[PDB]
Amino acid sequence: NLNDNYGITRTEALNLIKSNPNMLRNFINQNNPIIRNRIEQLILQCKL
């Protein structure tokens, strides 16, 4: 979804695949809805 809609560069895409905190925090700083939604989904999954 993210690559198809928000066109990403090779470097950012590769680092997201590698789960690089640098690019993950960069994307959250950009505040894009796909990443925001997924992170909120994980935090919700932490409900216990």
């Binding site: 979804n1 999954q45 216990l48």
Partner: protein
């Protein structure tokens, strides 16, 4: 068959352009091609019909060429014309009906109905006028095989199917969980439900999934995705899966949270849309994998609290729905629509004469059964009859 379409097109253009008072410059080329049609169809006798109740009828062609000296059409010209065009249209209509009714299992694309087999001969190649209609040009591409495409408004790709699955069940049917769906025409209405409101589910989240397998992959489709499926949002009683007893359930509709829609092409995740309602689009897809969740509401007004108890009774049953309308699509194979009158024409021509059931098509051309099993021979015959119905509908509306 391209010859048959050319005959239909030139007869239509004769009916339209050859009118009283028109300039001859407007119809010079048309009259020349009409004369080619007349002269190349002279002498060739044709036979049509002899299946079902469709009557055997014999056609013979001996007509005079339309005049060309006239610089402005008048009553005499047009009435002699219409005398010719009436007979020609009758011939074309009977040929189209006949080719619709007949069927074949091997070599379905090729013509049946010896009238059309003879028309496919090389003598009748000089009638080819132009192949501009969407159906005839897709047919030409298939013959010249390349990437064909039909634009369908609201295709009835989904077989009719109303059903459910229970992932938790017991003979009392007092505490259930599962999914329940209708696929009909261009609509998927899928509702997951749980009586306990995800009480003992992990994180108070009950996952639901639904996989709908199309038979042909739709290209560049626009899809309206909404929440809260309607048909599964009112209290109803449903026969058990075995069919012995019946179980009642009383929906309370809930927000479907973190809903996801995946569009797949042979297990190939081609599109994914997460928590995005409204209109969406799929590039190319053969399966639709919907997923959603029933989240127990963490905070509750006393009304909803009494509505959802922690005890056993569960007098109201939580549900979450989704509704998926394929508003438009592009499909390689031929399909019926809400905007086209090809399936209706073929079925009417079959029924009006009571054709015996074919070796290929289902009895009565019931679309649900025709599309549930849509093997390539069936597809080929369907394309043939649909294209013949386009050719006929050009003249006999």
């Amino acid at each position: 068959m391209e010859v048959l379409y050319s005959l239909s097109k030139t007869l239509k253009d004769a009916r339209d352009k050859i009118v009283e008072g028109t300039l001859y410059s407007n119809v010079s080329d048309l009259i020349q091609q009409f004369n080619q049609m007349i002269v190349t169809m002279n002498g060739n006798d044709f036979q049509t019909g002899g299946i079902g109740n469709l009557p055997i009828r014999n056609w013979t062609f001996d007509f005079g060429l339309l005049g060309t000296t006239l610089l402005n059409l008048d009553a005499n010209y047009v009435e002699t014309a219409r005398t010719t065009i009436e007979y020609f249209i009758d011939f074309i209509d009977n040929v189209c009906m006949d080719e619709m009714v007949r069927e074949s299992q091997r070599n379905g694309v090729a013509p049946q109905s010896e009238a059309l087999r003879k028309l496919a001969g090389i003598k009748f190649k000089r009638i080819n006028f132009n192949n501009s209609s969407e159906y005839i040009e897709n047919w030409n591409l298939q013959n010249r095989r390349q990437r064909t495409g039909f634009v369908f408004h609201k295709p009835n790709i989904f077989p009719y199917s109303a059903s459910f699955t229970l992932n938790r069940s017991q003979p009392m049917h007092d505490n259930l969980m599962g999914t329940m769906w209708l696929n009909a025409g261009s609509e998927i209405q899928v509702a997951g439900f749980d009586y306990s409101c995800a009480l003992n589910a992990p994180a108070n989240i009950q996952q639901f999934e639904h996989i709908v397998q199309l038979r042909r992959a739709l290209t560049t489709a626009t899809i309206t995705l909404l929440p809260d499926a309607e048909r599964f949002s009112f209290p109803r009683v449903i026969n058990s899966a075995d069919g012995a007893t019946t179980w009642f359930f009383n929906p309370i509709i809930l927000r479907p949270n973190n809903v996801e829609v995946e569009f797949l092409l042979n297990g190939q995740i081609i599109n994914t849309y997460q928590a995005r309602f409204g209109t969406i689009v799929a590039r190319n897809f053969d399966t639709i994998r919907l997923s959603f969740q029933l989240m127990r509401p963490p905070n509750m007004t006393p009304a909803v609290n009494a509505l959802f108890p922690q005890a056993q009774p569960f007098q109201h049953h939580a549900t979450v729905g989704l509704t998926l309308r394929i508003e438009s699509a592009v499909c390689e194979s031929v399909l019926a629509d809400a905007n086209e009158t090809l399936l209706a024409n073929v079925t009417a021509v079959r029924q009006e004469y009571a054709i015996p059931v074919g070796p290929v098509f289902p009895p009565g051309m019931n679309w649900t059964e025709l599309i549930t099993n849509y093997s390539p021979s069936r597809e080929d015959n369907l394309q043939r009859v649909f294209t013949v119905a386009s050719i006929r509908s050009m003249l006999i509306k």
